[PDB]
Design a protein around this ligand. Structure first.
Ligand code: GLU
Ligand code: GLU
Lengths: 461, 464
């Protein structure tokens, strides 16, 4: 389909879920306005800043070959064939992969051709095995720490009898496995385990909701689901008028589309997002965008028609500006920028280590090999973050398996200011659980009894 | 590395698990005598039979591009890049008759679906496959693991075994099979005592924690195994070392092969396994029993195999072992046909007829290669011809409903199985058939030798 390409001495790959997962007939339809467009624009802004940065590759110009996977592993594999058909203008690195299943297939395909790949949102425990995925780095922590954080949250609220539902794939099953192993040490007990298939209809979701409702002792529900699966589960719960205490993962995060149309079923839901900070320049760059001048983004027009419900053939949205509409920045934006910088400084040190003659692209560096680059410049890189706010203490480094520091934030979906239905941060998680129950509406002692879920209530002593 | 690159007008590639996982060079060490060389020679014999006869595919000669998969999905993916190198000595492959493991088959199918190359498997039974949404160019000759789970649940219900434990192997075969088995057991009011997942990952059991946990709960003496042949052997060796005896209800991974049970017959005296319904092929036995390391130059591994089966290393000269040059050949006294040979031979002919009915339609004027068949698109070859193929078994004298080779709407085979019990007769341990399974159960309890010479029971609590 449409391919976003630029010109430069070195071309960096890309893979974003611009569109959402389609139905049985179509391939993939609606455009993702937060996880598919904002991340793409963040990568473009980071590339522009790097090109304009004199201290970072003053002579080498970084290109772009951003593709679209639209939340499909098969579509991602089909699109990634262009990254390897050039070599078999070659692709230096692939800054892409927002889903574990999407990124795993791309990494497997790229390992044969020795093309390094640095992800920005892939959070899977099975991606740390360097024997299977030799050339793969990540900026975000794996699920090994997220499962521990959710287990700690469950233990803190004296929850024992819980139910788990996960999406069928490489992100949900591994999440359930890790959560169960880390809960066996504790007293956390899982009642039932439910799976959501890739091609799941509304009847199956209703059946899953009924299966969860069959056992009434369990009041909470541990979630390893994507955005679409979580939204469908919430819609089914709202249709069945069932209320739970959802404990979700980075898949839900702080998105507003998951709670769109199902605010009743999502009340006091505890979710975990990755530790992140807003980018000051990215917000201005995104708000100062129009569908006419921004002709380098083929999907942007498709986004605009979905932003204000217009049609270019009907001569609409002639006076609509993105600046007036409030802007909500995706949590996993800075990581994307970091990922780009993870291939920027890696291409800056190497140029200063193998070709110390000029600042341009010398003839000796034309066949860039991913082996030495990943093994000596990508896996061990330390630099200051590009757009740090204030004077906090954070560093961008890769571990032995190409990971990041496991810091998380806990959000609750609460209604304040006459039912605004907003997410409120009630603590964080770096090495131990330090949440605050004061901000949580249902955790206040005056509000009422704490929601409890136990197999057997404590009888007479 | 070694490979077979026999040239021809049409080349049918294949992938075989000739070498075992690990045990040398961190990739692959020892050679599978049963599942690595017998299936390879069966495919070679089928290719020779197709070329030598005139009824099937006249004129056109079939070549092979057989490659070795070192029992690893990553190694298989690395090797399969040569099949699509021409479309990316470039050879145009019209079909890949290969894939013995579920993970290997899944990876190969994922790679091949981009290049439109039909693939037929012969031993990969999994429920993740046959999903045409993601695997649109895969068609196996074996039923999925759903029928195996149903059969094993029926077997457990027949003996009133309710409190059973389950051990599975991580990957695309053990996990899906054990999930289907858990669903079936929950359907039939069977509760799993404990669930383990044997694997080689960073955080996995070390082949002793599983046995320790099994011994921790003596009330459940029945263990249901969903494991491959690479892990089942090591698990049974560890069980023999720990001197822990349990009755085994194993899946197709264990099968009816004696390679797994080598030096650990005592620990697995009571073992019930499920195998695909296969009859021996006399022609294959005749072809294989006449093989020698001197007249077989087209099989690079065979010589090495000759050094392993007979325990006679140093075929040319060395002090490692005696040189058994002659006076000792493959005979019926120590050679047993694999229980899936007809599944790989039929895996080849399925494409051959697909290449026979296609050339009879595109250019029927000439019975040879034609310019119209220069490019072989996988869609027309698979959907139009391969999907709806229908032919009798090439080497079965009987002509019945069980001797037909036809696919289904999902590209599968008939779900018929046989139950083998490990019995010690006359001081010799061997597998004996004690029933079958074709949508029903026909176990013969009167002819089953148990581990403790009595029918085992596995209940959570003793009836009161
Ligand atoms: N981390 C989740 C999704 C991340 C995201 O796209 O927000 C995954 O690996 O599928
Ligand atoms: N049939 C097993 C593999 C063992 C074999 O028959 O070769 C599977 O489903 O993967």
């Amino acid at each position: 389909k449409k391919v976003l390409t630029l010109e430069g001495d070195l071309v960096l790959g890309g893979l974003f879920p611009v569109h959402q997962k389609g139905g049985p007939a179509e391939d993939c339809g609606p455009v993702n306005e937060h996880r598919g467009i904002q991340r793409l624009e963040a990568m473009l802004f980071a590339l522009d800043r790097i090109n304009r940065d004199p201290h970072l590759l003053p002579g080498v110009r970084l290109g772009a070959h951003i593709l679209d996977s639209c939340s499909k592993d098969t579509h991602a594999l089909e699109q990634a064939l262009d990254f390897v058909r050039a070599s078999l203008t070659a692709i230096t690195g692939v800054i892409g992969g927002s889903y574990s299943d999407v990124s795993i297939q791309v990494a497997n395909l790229l390992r044969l051709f020795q093309i390094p790949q640095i992800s920005y949102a892939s959070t899977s425990a099975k991606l740390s095995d360097k024997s299977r995925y030799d050339y793969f780095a990540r900026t975000v922590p794996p699920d090994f720490f997220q499962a521990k954080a959710m287990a700690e949250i469950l233990r803190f609220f004296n929850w024992t009898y819980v139910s788990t539902v996960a999406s069928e794939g490489d992100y949900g099953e591994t999440g359930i496995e890790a959560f169960e192993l880390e809960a066996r040490a504790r007293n956390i007990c899982v009642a039932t385990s439910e799976k959501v298939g890739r091609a799941m209809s509304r009847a199956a979701f209703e059946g899953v909701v009924r299966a969860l409702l069959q056992k009434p002792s369990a009041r909470v529900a541990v979630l390893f689901t994507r955005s679409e699966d979580a939204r469908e589960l919430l819609a089914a719960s709202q249709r069945l008028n069932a209320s739970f205490t959802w404990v979700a993962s980075d898949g839900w995060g702080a998105l507003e589309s998951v709670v769109a149309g199902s605010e009743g079923a999502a009340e006091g839901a505890i979710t975990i997002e990755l530790a992140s900070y807003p980018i000051s320049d990215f917000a201005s760059y995104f708000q100062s965008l129009d569908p006419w001048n921004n002709s380098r983004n083929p999907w942007f027009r498709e986004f605009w028609e979905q932003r204000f419900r217009c049609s270019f053939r009907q001569r609409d949205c002639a006076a609509h500006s993105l600046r007036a509409v409030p802007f909500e920045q995706e949590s996993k934006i800075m990581f994307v920028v970091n990922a780009v910088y993870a291939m920027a400084h890696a291409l800056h040190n190497m140029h200063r280590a193998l070709c110390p003659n000029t600042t341009r692209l010398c003839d000796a560096m034309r066949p860039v090999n991913g082996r030495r680059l990943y093994k000596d410049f990508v896996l061990n890189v330390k630099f200051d973050a590009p757009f740090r706010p204030a004077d906090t203490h954070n560093e961008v480094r890769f571990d032995r398996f190409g990971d990041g520091i496991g810091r998380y934030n806990i959000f609750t979906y609460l209604r304040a200011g006459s039912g605004r239905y907003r997410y409120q941060k009630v603590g964080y998680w770096a090495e131990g659980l330090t949440l605050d129950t004061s901000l949580i509406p249902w955790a206040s002692p005056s509000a009422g009894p704490l929601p409890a879920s136990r197999c057997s209530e404590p009888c007479l002593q | 590395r070694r490979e077979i690159k026999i040239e021809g007008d049409l080349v049918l590639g294949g992938l075989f698990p000739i070498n075992e996982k690990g045990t040398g060079t961190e990739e692959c060490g020892r050679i599978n005598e049963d599942r690595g060389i017998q299936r390879l020679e069966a495919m070679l014999f089928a290719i020779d039979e197709i070329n030598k006869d005139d009824y099937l595919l006249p004129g056109v000669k079939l070549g092979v591009h057989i490659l070795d998969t070192c029992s690893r999905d990553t190694y298989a993916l690395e090797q399969s890049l040569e099949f699509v190198r021409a479309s990316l000595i470039p050879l145009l492959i019209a079909g890949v008759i290969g894939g013995s493991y579920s993970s290997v088959s899944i990876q190969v199918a994922n790679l091949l679906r981009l290049f439109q190359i039909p693939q037929i498997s012969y031993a990969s039974t999994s429920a993740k496959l046959s999903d045409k949404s993601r695997y649109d160019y895969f068609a196996r000759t074996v039923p999925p693991d759903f029928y195996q789970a149903k059969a094993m649940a029926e077997i457990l219900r027949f003996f009133n075994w309710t409190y059973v434990s389950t051990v599975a192997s991580e990957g695309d075969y053990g996990e899906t099979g054990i999930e289907a088995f858990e669903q079936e057991a929950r359907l039939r009011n069977i509760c799993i005592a404990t669930a383990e997942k044997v694997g080689r990952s960073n955080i996995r059991k070390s082949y002793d924690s599983v046995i320790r946990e099994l011994l921790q709960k003596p009330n459940a003496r029945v263990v249901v195994l969903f494991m491959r042949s690479d892990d089942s052997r090591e698990l049974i060796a560890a069980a023999s070392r720990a001197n822990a005896s349990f009755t085994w209800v194993a899946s197709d991974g264990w099968g009816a092969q004696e390679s797994i049970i080598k030096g650990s017959e005592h620990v697995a005296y009571g073992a019930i396994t499920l195998e695909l319904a296969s009859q021996p092929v006399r022609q294959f036995d005749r072809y294989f029993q006449s093989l020698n390391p001197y007249n077989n130059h087209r099989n690079p591994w065979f010589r090495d195999f000759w050094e392993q089966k007979f325990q006679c290393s140093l075929q040319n000269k060395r002090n490692h072992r005696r040189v058994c040059d002659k006076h000792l050949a493959i005979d019926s006294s120590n050679y047993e046909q694999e229980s899936k040979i007809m599944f790989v031979v039929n895996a080849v002919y399925a494409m051959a007829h697909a290449l026979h009915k296609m050339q009879r339609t595109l250019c029927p004027n000439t019975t040879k290669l034609c310019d119209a068949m220069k490019i072989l698109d996988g869609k027309k070859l698979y959907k139009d011809y391969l999907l709806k193929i229908n032919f009798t078994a090439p080497f079965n004298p009987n002509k019945d409903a069980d001797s037909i080779v036809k696919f289904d709407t999902f590209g599968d085979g008939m779900g018929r199985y046989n139950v083998f019990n490990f019995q010690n007769v006359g001081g010799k341990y061997s597998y004996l058939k004690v029933g079958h399974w074709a949508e029903t159960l026909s176990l013969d309890v009167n002819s089953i030798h148990w581990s403790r010479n009595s029918v085992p029971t596995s209940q959570c609590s003793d009836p009161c």
